[PDB]
Amino acid sequence: NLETMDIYRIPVQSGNHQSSQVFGFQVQPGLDGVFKHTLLGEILNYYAHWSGSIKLTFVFCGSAMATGKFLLAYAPPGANAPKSRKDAMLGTHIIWDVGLQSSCVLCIPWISQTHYRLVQQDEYTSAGNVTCWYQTGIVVPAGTPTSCSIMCFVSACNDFSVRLLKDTPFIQQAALLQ
Amino acid sequence: SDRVRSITLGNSTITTQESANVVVGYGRWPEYLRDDEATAEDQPTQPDVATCRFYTLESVTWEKDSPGWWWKFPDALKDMGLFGQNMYYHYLGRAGYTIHVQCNASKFHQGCLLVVCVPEAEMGCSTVDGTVNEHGLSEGETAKKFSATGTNGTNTVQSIVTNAGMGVGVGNLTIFPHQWINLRTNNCATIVMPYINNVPMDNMFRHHNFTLMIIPFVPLNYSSDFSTYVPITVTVAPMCAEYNGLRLSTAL
Amino acid sequence: SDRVRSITLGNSTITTQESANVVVGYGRWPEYLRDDEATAEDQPTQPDVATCRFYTLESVTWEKDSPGWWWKFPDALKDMGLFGQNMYYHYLGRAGYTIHVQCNASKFHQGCLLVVCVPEAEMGCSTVDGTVNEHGLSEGETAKKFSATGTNGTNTVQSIVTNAGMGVGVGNLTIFPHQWINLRTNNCATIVMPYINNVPMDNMFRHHNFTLMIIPFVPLNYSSDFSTYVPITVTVAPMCAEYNGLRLSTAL
Amino acid sequence: GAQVSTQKTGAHESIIHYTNINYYKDAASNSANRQDFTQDPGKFTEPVKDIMVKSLPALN
Amino acid sequence: GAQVSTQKTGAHESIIHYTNINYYKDAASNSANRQDFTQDPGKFTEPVKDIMVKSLPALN
Amino acid sequence: GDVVEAVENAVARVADTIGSGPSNSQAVPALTAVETGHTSQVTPSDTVQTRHVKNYHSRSESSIENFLSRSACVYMGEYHTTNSDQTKLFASWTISARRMVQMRRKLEIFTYVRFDVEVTFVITSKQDQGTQLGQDMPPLTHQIMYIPPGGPIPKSVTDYTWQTSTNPSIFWTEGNAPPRMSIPFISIGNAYSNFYDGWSHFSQNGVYGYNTLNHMGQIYVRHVNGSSPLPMTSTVRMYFKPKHVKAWVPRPPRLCQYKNASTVNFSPTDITDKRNSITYIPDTVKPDV
Numbered sequence A: 001n002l003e004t005m006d007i008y009r010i011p012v013q014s015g016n017h018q019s020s021q022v023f024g025f026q027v028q029p030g031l032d033g034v035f036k037h038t039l040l041g042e043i044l045n046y047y048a049h050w051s052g053s054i055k056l057t058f059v060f061c062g063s064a065m066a067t068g069k070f071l072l073a074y075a076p077p078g079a080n081a082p083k084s085r086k087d088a089m090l091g092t093h094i095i096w097d098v099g100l101q102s103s104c105v106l107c108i109p110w111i112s113q114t115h116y117r118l119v120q121q122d123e124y125t126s127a128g129n130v131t132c133w134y135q136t137g138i139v140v141p142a143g144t145p146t147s148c149s150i151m152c153f154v155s156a157c158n159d160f161s162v163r164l165l166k167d168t169p170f171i172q173q174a175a176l177l178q
Numbered sequence B, C: 001s002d003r004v005r006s007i008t009l010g011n012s013t014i015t016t017q018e019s020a021n022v023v024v025g026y027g028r029w030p031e032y033l034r035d036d037e038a039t040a041e042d043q044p045t046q047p048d049v050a051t052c053r054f055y056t057l058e059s060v061t062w063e064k065d066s067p068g069w070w071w072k073f074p075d076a077l078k079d080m081g082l083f084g085q086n087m088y089y090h091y092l093g094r095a096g097y098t099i100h101v102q103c104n105a106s107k108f109h110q111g112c113l114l115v116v117c118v119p120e121a122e123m124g125c126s127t128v129d130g131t132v133n134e135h136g137l138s139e140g141e142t143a144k145k146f147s148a149t150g151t152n153g154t155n156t157v158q159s160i161v162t163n164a165g166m167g168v169g170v171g172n173l174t175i176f177p178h179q180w181i182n183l184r185t186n187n188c189a190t191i192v193m194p195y196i197n198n199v200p201m202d203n204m205f206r207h208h209n210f211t212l213m214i215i216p217f218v219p220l221n222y223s224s225d226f227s228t229y230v231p232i233t234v235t236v237a238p239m240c241a242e243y244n245g246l247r248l249s250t251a252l
Numbered sequence D, E: 001g002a003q004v005s006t007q008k009t010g011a012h013e014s015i016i017h018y019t020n021i022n023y024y025k026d027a028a029s030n031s032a033n034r035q036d037f038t039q040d041p042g043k044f045t046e047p048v049k050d051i052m053v054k055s056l057p058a059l060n
Numbered sequence F: 001g002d003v004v005e006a007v008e009n010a011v012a013r014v015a016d017t018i019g020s021g022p023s024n025s026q027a028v029p030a031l032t033a034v035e036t037g038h039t040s041q042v043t044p045s046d047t048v049q050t051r052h053v054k055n056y057h058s059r060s061e062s063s064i065e066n067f068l069s070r071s072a073c074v075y076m077g078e079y080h081t082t083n084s085d086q087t088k089l090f091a092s093w094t095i096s097a098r099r100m101v102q103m104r105r106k107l108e109i110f111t112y113v114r115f116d117v118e119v120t121f122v123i124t125s126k127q128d129q130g131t132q133l134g135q136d137m138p139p140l141t142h143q144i145m146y147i148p149p150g151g152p153i154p155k156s157v158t159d160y161t162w163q164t165s166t167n168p169s170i171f172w173t174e175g176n177a178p179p180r181m182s183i184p185f186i187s188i189g190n191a192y193s194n195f196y197d198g199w200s201h202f203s204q205n206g207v208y209g210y211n212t213l214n215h216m217g218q219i220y221v222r223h224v225n226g227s228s229p230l231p232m233t234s235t236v237r238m239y240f241k242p243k244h245v246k247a248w249v250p251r252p253p254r255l256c257q258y259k260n261a262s263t264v265n266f267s268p269t270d271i272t273d274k275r276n277s278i279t280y281i282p283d284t285v286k287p288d289v
């Protein structure tokens, strides 16, 4: 999917898939592939330190007749990624009800031993993970597609800042006339 | 619109775009025990956020012929994070709850669920001159199932929906706090229950303060509606939990 | 007299009829984290009594040739009631402690123990170019033992008392908060330690905030004193425990 | 906008001061605080609750 | 005819300022404006006519 | 304020975390409509119970001035003390910040920029390799000359043109501090333009892009001692530190590598790195697997 519009689509569907986790990823805004080339990520890469809360907006793109509730969870570090909805709901989470408001915001509050984390994150400055689960499956009437996509947007909250300027790993050259 | 609604307890938040209202106990919001109502003399523990938050129980499937389901309450949350741990370590406990039952379908589906909290739902035995089991009463999360016919078996609850396991007319369960989930208009039910008992505090393993019952009155139905899977999910959040009489943990 | 003394935290009380004084950190009493010193933004849990009380660890025997003993700290209380449970469920924690070391003998016995709390007691390896084990560092309650000679073995701490496992002169451990238990005058030691670290809060499994060391400087001795059994017991009580970043429990 | 403060006294029991101006935008660029001389031995030599008057027994 | 302004605060919670004099005839010769810290995210995060109160639905 | 001044107070503090408790209402801050093109303004306190935190963190180092205002190499070239080629006796290029990527990607984050520039030159010389290496060459003195578009161009190290009666020049001798000077905002327009989706000719042809807008002249640099018994060679490095900056209409950071200096050309490149599955989260916290 590295060069196709799919990399941006989170697949979700009608029928019984509760045991099936929808997605999950580490919270390393400047380092993990999921975030590094994001607007927030590209910026973090020109610095060595970051701090702040992050907003993850999820937008449902199925038909208007589609329905459903999801559980969006964020787990601070210290344990491995929740492996079931039971485990995930013990952490920070919102239960999102698909409706006229197509989007839902999971805000990742800043919880850390230190005031700052390395953009080049290590285990010492771990930030945890966010995982998503069907809270109550996707139901749909006849004549409508039984599977759709959910998109995810990221952005910094107003308590966010960065420090210690450095060059980006992302750009380079072998010779002049660049 | 007033269909829209959000609720936040601890590190958890619930949302709905299709709510009815919110039912509150017998009009009473949960409160912590007052000094002029207390007997246990030791300082209470009030974990607050670590304990008063949304725990989601394992979901159930609504089938075209489901009779119903139930859960006993302080027990059922006994393995839920710190709420459960505080249960194991203390002799006495007290809490209120926000119960949020979720069930979405489609404008082309139909059905109607009664969602009730019955305080002190003492149940009858299948074997008329026998006695129940704790197992016949509750299975923690999961959920016991009502039945469409008379049941037999020693220890199990006489569970024909029609008499709600209590020997009354199921259709009269409405004197208890409740909401209905009518698929054509509504996709969730929210009930806030205050602590109700004849003593200020009590042991949370030995006494089921109340039972949550979800009974379909008009059955699930649909057509080529490539959605036959319609789950129901229960999320509950203890409110104002306080504990007394700390000692070693209870034997599982 | 001022030898007499009582202390109460939660549902527990300690007494002595032969105390010296009470040493307080670097003169600082424990306090809860202030808003202008915090970074973690979520609401903390402050279990209070359920958590801030006296836990007694398994005792040790003082023998005529015991080199000494030590315990790492937030870890060591990890299985102590709700203090431990709150540790497992949270990413961040913070606490102070009242440490009470007990050792009584008789007017005909003699000996002298140094009781110290060393903040950040990073220890060295026996195998000079190797690295330690978590096991070589701490065994929870119980207690690691210092040694009278140089030790070998990969992973174990180079524990010859003389260098306190840190590469310094044991007789200089006095710049750290401490008391002495000189059997002829005293039968217990009490030290109140405030939270000390370079960050406002921290993970309680990954970082040993401080080490408690009990090192006899003048050895136990006696005569036909039909009492050869002289135990030492450590009781500690977390103070102002607060936790942040709640999620599922950590993997043992 | 300069500061004048006194020099550390040397070889004898008004011209005993100097003037300084900071030319940089960051405090890190400033010179060292070699003239601050506070002290509080207490944190370490006497961290006992219950004040020890010592001219009195200390026990009893 | 000089200017005195404050230094960026460093390693601790009057001598925290510096003085500057411009010696050149062109503004281009001056040092950088590293101390100006304005901000207006709005141009970009919220360029919608019709104020979105967001605590309210956003549609309906 | 005035973005030309070397002083200006005020701390750039981020937001405090407002203390938040439990809620049961119709408020639904966590539910928005991304279709409007508006970015949600939700903070932790809108979705979880938060404590109050007095936050002192400042955004000082991410101000546009502090982000761009650091000297960056934008060019390097060589020239010889002695050679048969005449051409190799002096260096020359056309001013632009498009030949070294680091600087270029930084500027290209903005569509338009306006600023003064502090130019610093680092010049070094080495003695060329050969069989005979002994000589006693006095210190080398160089001449850097700027030729605004339209000025006569040097054709040899000894051309009359180096008289600089009017072009600005810098004479510098090795061993001393690197040469430096400020240049004002020199554009014909109101802001330097980093991108130009346009042409040079009115008939929608000619040259496309950045180049048609450039034309800031060129630089020529030569040795002045002019000689050395044995061959030597110098390298001139030029650094740009923009200062007194203003920037408009930010754009995404360049994702694909640059292919050349005159174009925005690129080869298709991956959106990001792959990972195993959409649920893959590595297991740290294990007795080491």
Ligand SMILES: NCCCCCCCCCCCC(=O)O
Pocket: F095, F096, F097, F107, F113, F117, F119, F146, F183, F186, F192, F193, F194, F216, F219
């Ligand atoms: N002797 C130095 C001559 C310097 C002229 C420099 C003009 C630099 C202009 C910066 C242009 C960057 C841009 O196109 O965005």
